[PDB]
Amino acid sequence: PLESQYQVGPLLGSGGFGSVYSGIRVSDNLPVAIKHVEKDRISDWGELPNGTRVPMEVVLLKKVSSGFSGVIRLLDWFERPDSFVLILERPEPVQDLFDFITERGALQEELARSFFWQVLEAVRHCHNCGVLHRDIKDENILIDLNRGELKLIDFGSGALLKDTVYTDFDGTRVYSPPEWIRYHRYHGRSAAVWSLGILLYDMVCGDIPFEHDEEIIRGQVFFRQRVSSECQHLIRWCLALRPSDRPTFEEIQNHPWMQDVLLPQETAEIHLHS
Ligand SMILES: N[C@H]1CC[C@H](Nc2cncc(-c3cccc(/C=C/C(=O)O)c3)n2)CC1
């Protein structure tokens, strides 16, 4: 019934993907996020295992649903005449990573390492469940501030993971790889790695490396902030122009810059004041 189940709070954020509100489950006072998505704006429609038409985003969220805290959990969903309403997990207190970096600037490498590791674990969880996120970026990462735990959100641009070529894309252009800009052709995992390179640069420098198509295509990385040689190496590897020159996930997590990660709780205690 929705109205009798949730008390709607203030708008957390909005866009083409939808409008996300703070909410509370009236049942047990659980903090939730209530995301509204217009039907007219859904491009990718999905198949439920029982044969009901839902947005692909619902398909993908159910597929990644788990006790694993690295990916946002879908709690319920509703269909309305003109929209879908998604009830999502909400950590409290929380801060979106984009806002975190906007406030604090370039992150210390120990913190970036902890954050980047957790994103890698979350993205590996998605792929292992057959889900390609397609919009990995700071804005789509929430920080559980008490626990030091990160959560991937916004599966509205995602697709089922396949090993064949993707010829469609509606994620964030400044995180999209050169093969998409030039050819309108990418493969899931190597494009994901590219976006991860953009993200890591963003963490350690406080902003993204490329603004224009010409820059993405050239792939020349300039460091505006002091960044260790190992981190620079990892970033430049992720941002290899040829998709096949990019590291696998295993290679990223075995990289020397990635050793001795802090646990999330240690991360909270040292860097999040907790
Ligand atoms: N692309 C979106 C735009 C709204 C942004 N705003 C915020 C800010 N603070 C918290 C949240 C939030 C809290 C709980 C769940 C979610 C999930 C959103 C989603 O899956 O789309 C999002 N969302 C998040 C990224």
mmCIF file of C-alpha atoms and ligand atoms in Angstrom, residues 12-13 17 33 35 72 88-90 96 139-140 142 153-154, ligand 1:
data_model
loop_
_atom_site.group_PDB
_atom_site.id
_atom_site.type_symbol
_atom_site.label_atom_id
_atom_site.label_comp_id
_atom_site.label_asym_id
_atom_site.label_seq_id
_atom_site.Cartn_x
_atom_site.Cartn_y
_atom_site.Cartn_z
ATOM 1 C CA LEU A 12 18.124 13.451 -1.106
ATOM 2 C CA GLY A 13 18.824 13.914 -4.814
ATOM 3 C CA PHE A 17 17.498 8.499 -13.250
ATOM 4 C CA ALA A 33 15.485 5.627 0.565
ATOM 5 C CA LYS A 35 13.430 6.230 -5.327
ATOM 6 C CA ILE A 72 22.732 -1.147 -1.999
ATOM 7 C CA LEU A 88 16.155 1.012 -0.781
ATOM 8 C CA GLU A 89 18.446 0.564 2.196
ATOM 9 C CA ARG A 90 19.635 3.824 3.791
ATOM 10 C CA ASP A 96 27.736 10.517 -0.784
ATOM 11 C CA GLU A 139 28.252 10.203 -6.928
ATOM 12 C CA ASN A 140 27.140 6.532 -7.015
ATOM 13 C CA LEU A 142 27.699 6.118 -0.367
ATOM 14 C CA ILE A 153 24.060 2.721 -5.650
ATOM 15 C CA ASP A 154 22.050 3.678 -8.751
HETATM 16 N N1 LIG B 1 22.762 9.261 -8.945
HETATM 17 C C1 LIG B 1 22.267 9.542 -7.579
HETATM 18 C C2 LIG B 1 21.727 10.978 -7.454
HETATM 19 C C3 LIG B 1 21.225 11.258 -6.021
HETATM 20 C C4 LIG B 1 22.381 11.092 -5.008
HETATM 21 N N2 LIG B 1 21.931 11.482 -3.648
HETATM 22 C C5 LIG B 1 21.983 10.845 -2.472
HETATM 23 C C6 LIG B 1 22.506 11.505 -1.356
HETATM 24 N N3 LIG B 1 22.508 10.899 -0.170
HETATM 25 C C7 LIG B 1 22.017 9.658 -0.018
HETATM 26 C C8 LIG B 1 21.458 8.984 -1.112
HETATM 27 C C9 LIG B 1 20.950 7.660 -1.029
HETATM 28 C C10 LIG B 1 20.643 7.024 0.176
HETATM 29 C C11 LIG B 1 20.176 5.694 0.185
HETATM 30 C C12 LIG B 1 20.022 4.999 -1.015
HETATM 31 C C13 LIG B 1 20.314 5.625 -2.228
HETATM 32 C C14 LIG B 1 20.192 4.927 -3.437
HETATM 33 C C15 LIG B 1 19.932 5.492 -4.688
HETATM 34 C C16 LIG B 1 19.863 4.685 -5.835
HETATM 35 O O1 LIG B 1 20.067 3.446 -5.755
HETATM 36 O O2 LIG B 1 19.617 5.257 -6.908
HETATM 37 C C17 LIG B 1 20.793 6.934 -2.212
HETATM 38 N N4 LIG B 1 21.465 9.609 -2.316
HETATM 39 C C18 LIG B 1 22.929 9.668 -5.113
HETATM 40 C C19 LIG B 1 23.385 9.359 -6.554
#
